[PDB]
Amino acid sequence: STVEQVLEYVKSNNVKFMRFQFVDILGVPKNVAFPIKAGEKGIEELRDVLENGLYFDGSSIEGFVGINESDMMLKPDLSTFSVLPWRPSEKSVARVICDVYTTKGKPFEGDPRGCLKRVMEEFKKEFNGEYFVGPEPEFFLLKKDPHNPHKYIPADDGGYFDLEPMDEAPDIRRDIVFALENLGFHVEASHHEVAPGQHEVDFKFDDALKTADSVITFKTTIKTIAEQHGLKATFMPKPFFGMNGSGMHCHQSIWLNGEPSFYDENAPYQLSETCMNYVAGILKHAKAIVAITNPTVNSYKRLVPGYEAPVNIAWANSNRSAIIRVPAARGKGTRIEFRAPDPSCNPYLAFTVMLAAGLDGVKNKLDAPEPVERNIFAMSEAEKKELGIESVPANLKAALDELENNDVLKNALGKHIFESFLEIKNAEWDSFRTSVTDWETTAYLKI
Amino acid sequence: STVEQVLEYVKSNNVKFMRFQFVDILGVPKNVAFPIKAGEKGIEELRDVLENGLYFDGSSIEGFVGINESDMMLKPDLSTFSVLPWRPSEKSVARVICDVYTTKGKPFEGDPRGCLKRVMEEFKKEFNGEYFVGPEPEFFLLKKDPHNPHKYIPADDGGYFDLEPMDEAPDIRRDIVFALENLGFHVEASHHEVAPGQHEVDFKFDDALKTADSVITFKTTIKTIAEQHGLKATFMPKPFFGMNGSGMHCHQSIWLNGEPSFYDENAPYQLSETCMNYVAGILKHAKAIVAITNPTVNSYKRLVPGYEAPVNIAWANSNRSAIIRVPAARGKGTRIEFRAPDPSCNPYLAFTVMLAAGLDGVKNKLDAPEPVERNIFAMSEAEKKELGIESVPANLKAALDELENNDVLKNALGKHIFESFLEIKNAEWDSFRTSVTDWETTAYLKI
Amino acid sequence: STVEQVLEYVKSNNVKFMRFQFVDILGVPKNVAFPIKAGEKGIEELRDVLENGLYFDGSSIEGFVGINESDMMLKPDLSTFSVLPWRPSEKSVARVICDVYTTKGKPFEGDPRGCLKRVMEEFKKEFNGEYFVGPEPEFFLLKKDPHNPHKYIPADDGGYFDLEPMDEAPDIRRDIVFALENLGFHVEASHHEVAPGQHEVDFKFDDALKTADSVITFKTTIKTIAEQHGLKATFMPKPFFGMNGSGMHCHQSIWLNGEPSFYDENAPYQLSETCMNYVAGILKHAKAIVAITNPTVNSYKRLVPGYEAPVNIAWANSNRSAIIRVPAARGKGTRIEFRAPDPSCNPYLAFTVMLAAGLDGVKNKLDAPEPVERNIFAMSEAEKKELGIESVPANLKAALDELENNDVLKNALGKHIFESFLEIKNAEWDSFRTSVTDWETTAYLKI
Numbered sequence A, B, C: 001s002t003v004e005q006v007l008e009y010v011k012s013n014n015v016k017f018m019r020f021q022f023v024d025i026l027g028v029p030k031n032v033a034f035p036i037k038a039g040e041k042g043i044e045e046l047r048d049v050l051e052n053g054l055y056f057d058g059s060s061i062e063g064f065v066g067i068n069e070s071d072m073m074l075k076p077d078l079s080t081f082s083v084l085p086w087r088p089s090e091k092s093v094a095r096v097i098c099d100v101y102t103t104k105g106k107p108f109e110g111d112p113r114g115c116l117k118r119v120m121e122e123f124k125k126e127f128n129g130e131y132f133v134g135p136e137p138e139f140f141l142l143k144k145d146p147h148n149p150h151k152y153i154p155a156d157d158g159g160y161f162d163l164e165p166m167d168e169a170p171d172i173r174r175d176i177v178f179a180l181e182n183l184g185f186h187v188e189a190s191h192h193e194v195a196p197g198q199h200e201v202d203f204k205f206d207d208a209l210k211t212a213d214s215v216i217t218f219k220t221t222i223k224t225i226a227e228q229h230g231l232k233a234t235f236m237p238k239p240f241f242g243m244n245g246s247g248m249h250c251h252q253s254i255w256l257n258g259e260p261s262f263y264d265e266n267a268p269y270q271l272s273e274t275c276m277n278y279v280a281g282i283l284k285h286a287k288a289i290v291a292i293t294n295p296t297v298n299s300y301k302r303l304v305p306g307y308e309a310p311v312n313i314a315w316a317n318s319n320r321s322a323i324i325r326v327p328a329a330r331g332k333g334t335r336i337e338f339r340a341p342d343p344s345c346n347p348y349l350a351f352t353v354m355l356a357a358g359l360d361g362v363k364n365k366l367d368a369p370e371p372v373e374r375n376i377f378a379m380s381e382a383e384k385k386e387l388g389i390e391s392v393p394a395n396l397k398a399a400l401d402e403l404e405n406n407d408v409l410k411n412a413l414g415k416h417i418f419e420s421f422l423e424i425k426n427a428e429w430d431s432f433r434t435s436v437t438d439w440e441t442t443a444y445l446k447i
């Protein structure tokens, strides 16, 4: 957190490299290594670079600035210092997540991290609240197909919570948990998931900024540790058809004045009015939130309408068929689980749109619908239409049009992020709709 | 720096070999190893060879002397002593960069290192200045193509500043930085570059001679360490079509009387008249400087007119589309970035022509044009012609003809370097224009 | 020549398909097959399509019309009727070369065949002349490389005029000559040429239109018969480095009032003033004619300045070192051989520019230089500069700039052909200068 606490770690623990990490518009991490020199001269050089930051070409980063105005800076947040465990111990490598700033020393408008800081500071100023998030990012461990090395397949034919040798990843998950604990994570649980080769490593909830910094670090840690064990980890929302997809369920709650505002001992389901207003806001902008929280073309193969998925815009208690599920835990742990996201989204922008839509419901005091305790997959389309259970868009372009017409998310993301995201994703969608797919070749080459 | 300091290190550190290194006309390093014998007899033998120098066949070195007058000598610069880290630690190998001298003990006219010393001593005598340079030499890490071992491809599908495992070179860059630090380099930053398998390792600026000595050692260090990790590093300006090329942006500035002459607190853009006169001189001889700073046929595939490259002869503040870019840093760090060079050039001759053209503008007090803050790539050829933004030559022969007619660079390089360079490069160009290329076979074999 | 003569041959010889052939701007032949029906109804259908022609999409043809004005027509030239021998004999396939016409029934401006007809009709109207041409189009017979099937090599290690089995093409040349004789050719001689696998099949001279129609049919006849004998023929100007290239020497002469105007019994070298004026005109526009007669990038690897080639702009008697050679035959056979062309050029445009530059000399009565009887390759560059022997451009772009500034060839080709040719060839040149060649990879990957 303090300059001296970082410099004295570097002196005693023999740190040789400092990675200045950040994220592009799509949530891909980017960094530059700075070599620390020995003695006081090296520590005073590092002090200048930690306080004043360093320059970088912004035109090469996705969704940042043009070539004619490329000069940018990185101001390190010292409260995010950590030692990368996958790197060597002697002459160790360390990281410090930064905020992208303009040449004039002003926070960059198109920065995803600064976008989340802005909305959290605005929430803390207006309501004196703290936005807490706890995600469940699932992933797949892959190995080369023996019949064809150009394709990849799942690492094992394991099921949900299966034991070894059926589950061939206890050693891979073991090292992942050790690596995350060294990075400052409070790991809660680890196990095999429903689909073959699928796994899930959960971690404790925290404020949206610390949680988004943890999601970026979690994705790199899982990919780099898998390569050490000769495997390849992917956070693709649906790498294989006919089996479960990778989902990042976001358990969330807001605490006004250091108290659990979502809990109300004397109320229906022990849920406060603030909780219901927040849920109403998420359900209102649900068709627009999935553009950010599900930004890939493949996301709409897991989150597919008309088929078993968290596509139905409705809330329910202890029911995994609806888009929102209220876990049975009460008191401090009273929360809502937004099941629509997948680990392909930028966490900084995902928590921004969720907090903005949720706070829109709290500010206007919007009325939430009744909980659909029944299984929604077993219901017919005519029955769901009578109840008013709408579905999330069927494809990426359908979600981008909903995001474009939404003014609540446009203001939260800002003109720079909102317009660049739509422009990048429309070019990505155009590339998909023009390409001749393998499905088409299989179905129409015979005609 | 002195004879005794070198012999004191050689004695204690068990140095067993001394490489007498130098460079040919094209900037290719050349050296001869000397074994240091044990005891006082070995130290006194090494002493005699360090002061009086040693002989070598000059006819075999490129652009040096004929067979009928081949006897030459190497006078070591004792301050350039360094232990090669890629060589063993026990019975360590050391190097000493030398100045090529004639049999009569007079500095050789056709020596690139002596050419840079001459112009720097002339500048220090006339203006009491110090010419500082800080380059950014980019390179590619390659691996054999699995589909064909005779061809090479990039080591990874990484982008700008990408993180591991997408960036497969943190271990290669780690050892590069450690090796350069042992050689006396002040490494500033290291990261992955825009094109696949492309990387960039930056180092602190220094006087042109110490910087040119560092560029030669840097190129060898990067190539030798890559071979240790089973890869092959290349400083080719454009090894692959459709992706960024290797560029060596030269950040430079002159300090008259130990003061930053380029900075002026009370002036437009906080840039002095001396800075504008220097920029005017570079832009004047821009068509001739690219012959030396871009001496390969392949250089004009990266630095290609009509396409996105630093080809437009103009200057601008924080704009990477023009040939010169003035970084936003001010005070001591006030400088100009000549973006046209690539790491294929001889650094000793590149800094000589840049200082000569720049000083031609300072001596005559030439008027620089207005800065083109707009993106020059988006401009049309008719618009660029109205403004007067000329382009650098389209090929090697076009640049050699410009260098031949330029009298400012002819005098700085000297009759020996100027004529031998043109003769060697014209034979190189003739070999290219007569050879039947793979592009021609693909396009015209069908006709 | 008339509709009835063509329908009478079709009736008796059992012709089942009628190809309507023509050429694009680059000289590539293009055609559409029309199946002839049996009985009177089929002959009356064929009569209608022969008299009125047929429609086709002009936007798909190179250098013709845009997509918004694509409707075009083909008016058959009945004199160019011929039977394709390589096609089956029973239910034979006949061809008829056509003139491209606009929807309004007016000759198309951008038609290469109509361009040659226009200048020949203008010459016959103004001077009452007949432009005769007799080319020598050389070609290479290739076979797959046994060490690598992806590459091609020459069919045999034969030399000039060599005998079998050293010359492995007597059977291939035999069938070529039989096929050309059936198409109406007057074949003069056939033999093996200097380079390995290179051959030459000569044919009698005729008026420029009949000769250009023969060059197109010859190129197709050579390639189709080569594929029948398991080989691949190429008219590439220089498929391999270090061996002779394919050249199309154009023997030409003009006959005013049915008399050999180039011959003069009482004159120096027995050559008339009209011959000298014509030669002066070719030498004047020589730098611009090579843009059309040598339109490929590869053409400047055969026609390479500074090396043994017909690059020297000068004329001489029985000397193959100069651009023009006057063969020793006199009387009717008095002619000039323009040695610069290669079989990669469009014959219709090549004969147009040669006749236009030649007639420019006749109209203005330009003075020709003295004949250089000495070998020009043995001369030094300083000696050739004193005599005034200039050289043809070193590359495609250098020739396109000369063609652009030439007003004589601009008028002969017309605004449509002149501008489209320059536009197509500049895009072709830009593709070459941007591509990374195999020569560059071999020479610079090591640096």
Ligand SMILES: O=C(O)CCC(=O)C(=O)O
Pocket: A169, A170, A171, A173, A174, A177, A190, A191
């Ligand atoms: O497998 C896991 O989920 C954690 C590691 C573990 O339990 C083990 O090492 O056996």
Ligand SMILES: O=C(O)CCC(=O)C(=O)O
Pocket: A017, A019, A032, A033, A087, A093, B169, B170, B171, B173, B174, B177, B190, B191, B192
């Ligand atoms: O990756 C770099 O640029 C330097 C090396 C490094 O940071 C590492 O060893 O992880």
Ligand SMILES: O=C(O)CCC(=O)C(=O)O
Pocket: C169, C170, C171, C173, C174, C175, C177, C190, C191
């Ligand atoms: O080979 C030739 O040049 C023509 C054909 C021939 O003479 C032959 O059939 O042997």
Ligand SMILES: [Mg+2]
Pocket: B054, B055
């Ligand atoms: Mg010796």
Ligand SMILES: [Mg+2]
Pocket: A032, A054, A055, B188, B189
């Ligand atoms: Mg830096």
